[PDB]
């Protein structure tokens, strides 16, 4: 009949090919589709939703709900650091196990922007001010309130707004999101002074993820049964 | 570079999900695998980011043999042929290597001689419902959901051999096709413990450091 000629790589099994395949069960008349709410077309839609960041690990709050709460009290010092965490990727940091960082551990190369939303979970009668400094990659962490003001910063007034949004790039020193006391917490009588702060993270623009791999957070020693 | 995070480029991969051995003359030797996705820990974590899935199925078997120590006197065997029977949900099940359930007509089998391309076969979306369900909050025993049932596979030799014992292994490769996913779900933090249920032991939220600043 027709003369053919088999090339090398013919009777092999490459695990990442895409060929047609003979159906074991034809003539079955499968069940038609149904409108189920909440269809996912892309995994980036899971990364763009917010999630609380455990900034307060401290070796015994990781097995509690105290990891998510940043303590704020009325102290006696003039300028003092509230928190601070680097943006180094993956190296045991606080953005690792969040809803964003569980997707970026499935891929090898990624680059984009990051939303960082804060929220003052205190009383409605308390008033204060905070700096939200950002160190670029390469620049050092500020060791004082004054040279944190001389960089890029956002002064967050608690008595006016109760949420501050801070957009920032993050690419696979890599940055710091340190925060400082500007003024103390002024409070009336019969109102508690020790307040808390929650922090959120998201994906501002669309990222670009590439070169899928397996996650380092899951392993098994013998088949579950 | 935004398209490698789609549902088709995330879940449609190949993965070794089972590995079993069987010999010919032990009169107990044949393999058996109930088709599920909850055996390995890296495919289970990817399919449990969503609640309802709906996919076709494509399986490829890699079968090798090995000569067991016989007695003496010039063991010379021909090529070996294997049978890979697929039992649909609600079908007869073999208990011995010689049984009436191997010869039934509604269990589609493949026959494959050694030295050729591996025997791929494909299974469509078989269910009474409209999607598979990774999670089930209810009773059938708690959280079983008998509606997503894909069947069972059985493997054996069809060659009778007396001069030499021969044992064989098989690796089953798993690949979803035309995947659709609904209702996303947060990724699992604790390690997996059992296959059927979602039992766990409580673990910390993240890795800890020495100070907040």
């Amino acid at each position, epitope marked *: 009949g027709l003369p053919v000629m088999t090339t090398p790589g013919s009777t092999q099994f490459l695990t990442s090919d895409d060929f047609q395949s003979p159906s074991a069960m034809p003539q079955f008349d499968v069940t038609p589709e149904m409108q189920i709410p909440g269809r996912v077309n892309n995994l980036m839609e899971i990364a763009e939703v917010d999630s609380v960041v455990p900034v307060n690990n401290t*070796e015994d709050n*990781v*097995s509690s709900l105290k990891a998510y709460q940043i303590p704020v009290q009325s102290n006696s010092d003039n300028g003092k650091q509230v928190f601070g965490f680097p943006l180094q990727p993956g190296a045991n940091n606080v953005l690792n196990r969040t809803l964003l960082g569980e997707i970026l551990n499935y891929y090898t190369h990624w680059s984009g922007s990051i939303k960082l939303t804060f929220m003052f979970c205190g009383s409605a009668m308390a008033t204060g001010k905070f700096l939200l400094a950002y160190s670029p990659p390469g620049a050092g962490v500020p060791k004082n309130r004054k040279d944190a003001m001389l960089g890029t910063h956002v002064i967050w007034d608690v008595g006016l707004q109760s949420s501050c949004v801070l957009c920032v790039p993050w690419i696979s020193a890599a940055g710091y999101v340190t925060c400082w006391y500007q003024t103390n917490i002024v409070v009336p009588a019969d109102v508690q002074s020790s307040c808390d702060i929650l922090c959120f993270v998201s994906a501002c623009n669309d990222f670009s993820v590439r070169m899928l791999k397996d996650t380092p957070f899951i392993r*098994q*020693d*013998t088949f*579950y049964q | 570079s935004r398209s490698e995070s789609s549902i088709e480029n995330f879940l449609c991969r190949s993965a070794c999900v089972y590995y079993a051995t069987y010999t010919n003359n032990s009169k107990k030797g044949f393999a058996e695998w109930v088709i599920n996705t909850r055996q390995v820990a890296q495919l289970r974590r990817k399919l449990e980011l969503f609640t309802y899935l709906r996919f076709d199925l494509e399986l490829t078997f890699v079968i090798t043999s090995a000569q067991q120590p016989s007695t003496a006197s010039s063991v010379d065997a021909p090529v070996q042929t294997h049978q890979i029977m697929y039992v649909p949900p609600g079908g007869p099940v073999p208990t011995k290597v010689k049984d009436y359930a191997w010869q039934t007509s509604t269990n589609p089998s493949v026959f494959w001689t050694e030295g050729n391309a591996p025997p791929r076969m494909s299974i469509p979306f078989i269910s009474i419902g409209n999607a598979y369900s990774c999670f089930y909050d209810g009773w059938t025993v708690y959280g079983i959901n008998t509606l997503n049932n894909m069947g069972t596979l059985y493997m054996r030799h069809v060659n009778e051999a007396g001069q030499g014992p021969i044992k064989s292994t098989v690796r089953i490769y798993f690949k979803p096709k035309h995947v659709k996913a609904w209702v996303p779900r947060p990724p699992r933090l604790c*390690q*997996y*413990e*059992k296959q059927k249920n979602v*039992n766990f*032991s*409580p*673990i*910390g939220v993240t*890795t*800890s450091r020495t100070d907040i600043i």
Partner: nanobody, 117 residues
Framework: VQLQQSAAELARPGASVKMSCKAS????????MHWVKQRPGQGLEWIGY????????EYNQKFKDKTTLTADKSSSTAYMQLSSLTFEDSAVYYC???????????WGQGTLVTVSA
């Protein structure tokens, strides 16, 4: 990937000892660490475990009032202290790491505790 215990001990009746089991090759605060006692005339016997993430311990009913299991994140060890030592507490104590809820995959080499005068 292995576990390493201490050396052999020796104590008077009424005194107390403290063993250890240094884990290496894996993330220490993920899996629980169990303790098994083997008297030389009988089989193995379970004592209890400790969850190294939340420092939650759960003991057997026979070993509740004597043993005490602690841990630390820095040196990646897991201690065990036996109090009110008697003559039937002379055995070999192993440390094991449980995975998949029943399997003890990795064991230690065991420490020999002897009581005398």
């Amino acid at each position: 990937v292995q576990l390493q215990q201490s050396a052999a001990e020796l104590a008077r009746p009424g005194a107390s000892v403290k063993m250890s089991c240094k884990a290496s090759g894996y993330t220490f605060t993920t899996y629980t660490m169990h303790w098994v006692k083997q008297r030389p005339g009988q089989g193995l016997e379970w004592i209890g475990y400790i969850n190294p993430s939340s420092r939650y311990t759960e003991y057997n009913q026979k070993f509740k009032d004597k043993t005490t299991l602690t841990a630390d994140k820095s040196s990646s060890t897991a201690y065990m202290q036996l109090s009110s030592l008697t003559f039937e507490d002379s055995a070999v104590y192993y440390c094991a790491r449980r995975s998949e809820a029943d399997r003890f995959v990795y064991w230690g080499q065991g420490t020999l505790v002897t009581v005398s005068a």
